[PDB]
Amino acid sequence: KNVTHPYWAPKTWKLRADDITTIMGFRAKLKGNLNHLDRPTPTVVNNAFIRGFLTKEDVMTWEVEAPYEAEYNIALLYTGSNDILSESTFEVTSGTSKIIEKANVKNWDTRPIVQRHYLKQNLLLKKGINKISFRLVTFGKEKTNANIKPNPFAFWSIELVRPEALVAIKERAKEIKADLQWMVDGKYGLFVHFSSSSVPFEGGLKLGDQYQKLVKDFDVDVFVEKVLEIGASWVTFTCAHGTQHWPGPSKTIDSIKSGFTCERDLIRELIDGLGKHNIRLMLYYNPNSGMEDLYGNTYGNGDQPDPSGYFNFLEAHFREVSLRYGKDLASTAGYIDDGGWKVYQLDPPWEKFVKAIKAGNPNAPVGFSQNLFPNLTPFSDLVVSDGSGRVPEIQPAFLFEKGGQLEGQYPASWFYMDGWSSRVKNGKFTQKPKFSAEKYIEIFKKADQVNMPITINLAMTPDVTKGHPIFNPESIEIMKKVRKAVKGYLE
């Protein structure tokens, strides 16, 4: 039943002794009813969970390679019905080491939906090849307000780190942690999707089909005046949303495949345009969308999977961009998309990415989108996920305490008023705002009261010119009232 392309097939995992190593559940050999959605091509499959932990025989077994004997702390990532978790007991074994612990009940209503569970007892691993097994030994089941889809115990990944390496890791995470006071004081910012799939206002090919032209015609002063009108204190600008087109020079991208960069350094002109008004610029970057047409498969070609080429492209890219603009750019990683669903599954070197992001700007906030997952890496700065058009969740305080799901991160909200990508048909915007201006005022007012920065998206036409509104005027009108209620004079 279970299908895995050789790049995703179970295999022996080299443990990095000074580091957190993460191993996806599908990389273990599976017995019994344990199953996962098919993974037939080299392309990552988001829904990687392992399901089927119904009996004491549904066992999964990893083969790890510990360079020497040592005690590793174990973390499990899983989700499922709280009625199942309330009566589920884990068993982690290797050789004669045997950890037994009850599951944690999710006692918060917000994200993260998947939880990270640090087991109390450590795990001895011999030198060389080890076999690590995971299974349930006691079982809950779902109880009786009436839906259809079940919510079984679903296993995502196992994590292993020597407790000495963990303390040292957290020490360096603390030493480079970003100061987000400029974001708290700014109160809110603008998310702008320069999406490769958006159709121009005036008609024509989508952005990803005439990218260089639209970058040459982009009017920075038209854009900066609308940003300044709505009160935004920063802009998170979409690079490579849907394709790997990048709105400026890049020796790293050019070195993989030509055609994706621009002669016009639009990033530079956005920095200088916005900076006349003390408005900062952070980048969105998508490391998967259209990557097959730039780098190819994340794990390469040839018989066996090798991510190192992919990882180096990312590190060099983050580094070059960070150095090219320096402190002038607030961050080249304000929003790195699908850090959780996609990047996490390759077991990436998070620290190298982060050191690359901060190389030119040591206060650059790093925001890997963790989707519905807990903190991706101790080196995160911001909570990052896609809020669609909903009221922002207030994540309870205890998630951010030591041990917590989100320890080390600072709350932040990312969502849209009308839509993510503009959908303009016949010179009229087709995505209206979701809420009344009064509700948005309440949203922004509460986020200000709790010092949670907000980055709201207003859908934008990709042809930024003088000819037409680039933002939905209803959306703009709402945001002008928001600016009055939150950033204007109060008495």
Instruction: Single out the segment in contact with Mg ion by CB under 5 A; choices: 65-73, 103-111, 373-381, 451-459.
Output: 451-459
Structure tokens at 381: 């700065």
- Backbone breaks in the chain after residues (C–N over 2.5 Å): 144
Residue nearer to Mg ion on the CB measure, 230 or 262: 230
Give least dist CB 453 to Mg ion, A.
Answer: 8
| C-alpha–C-alpha distance, residues 477 and 438, integer Å | 12
Task: Examine residue 442 and tell whether it contacts Mg ion (CB under 5 A).
Answer: no
Using the minimum distance from each CB to Mg ion, give the nearer residue, 186 or 273: 186
Q: In terms of CB distance, is 186 or 367 closer to Mg ion?
A: 186
Residue 97 neighbours by CB under 8 Å, 6+ apart = 123, 124, 125
Q: Are β-strands 413-416 and 331-336 bridged in parallel, bridged antiparallel, or unpaired?
A: unpaired
| Minimum distance, C-beta of residue 260 to Mg ion, in the bound complex (Å) | 39
Instruction: Choose the stretch contacting Mg ion; rule: CB under 5 A; options: 4-12, 216-224, 321-329, 449-457.
Output: 449-457
Buried b (16+ CB within 10 A) or exposed e, 66-97: beeebebbbbbbbbbbbebbeebebbbbbeeb
Residue ranges in 298-357 that form contacts with Mg ion under rule CB under 5 A: none
Q: Minimum distance between the CB of residue 179 and Mg ion, rounded to whole angstroms?
A: 15
* Choices 117-125, 264-272, 421-429, 441-449 (CB under 5 A): range interacting with Mg ion: 441-449
Query: Rounded to the nearest whole angstrom, what is the least distance from the CB of residue 411 to Mg ion in the complex?
Result: 11
Q: How far is the CB of 452 from Mg ion (least distance, A)?
A: 8
Please state the length of the chain.
491
Shortest spacing between CB 187 and Mg ion, in angstroms: 6
In angstroms, give the least distance from the CB of 467 to Mg ion: 37
186/340 with CB nearer Mg ion: 186
C-alpha 215: how far from chain center: 26
Judged by CB under 5 A, does residue 448 bind Mg ion? yes
- Closer residue to Mg ion in complex, CB, 248/453: 453
Residue 451 interacts with Mg ion (CB under 5 A)?
yes
Q: Do the strands 12-14 and 29-30 form a parallel or antiparallel pair, or are they unpaired?
A: unpaired
- Beta-strand ranges (E) seen in 365-443 are 413-416, 424-425, 428-429
Nearer to Mg ion, 222 or 485 (CB): 485
Query: Nearer to Mg ion by C-beta: 151 or 181?
Result: 181
Distances (CA, A) of 442 to 50, 123, 475: 41, 49, 16
Burial of residue 43, with CB atoms counted within 10 A of its CB: 0-12 exposed, 13-18 middle, 19 or more buried: middle
Residue 91 as a binder of Mg ion (CB under 5 A): the answer is no
Judge whether 95 and 353 are in contact, CB under 8 Å: no
In the complex with Mg ion, the residue whose CB is nearer, 133 or 451, is 451
Point out which span in 71-79, 112-120, 387-395, 444-452 binds Mg ion (CB under 5 A): 444-452
407 sits near Mg ion (criterion: CB under 5 A): no
10 Å CB burial of residue 339 (0-12, 13-18, 19+) is buried
The least distance separating Mg ion from the CB of residue 333, rounded to whole angstroms, comes to 24
| Contact (Cβ atoms closer than 8 angstroms) between residue 351 and residue 381 | no
Binding residues vs Mg ion (CB under 5 A): 448, 451
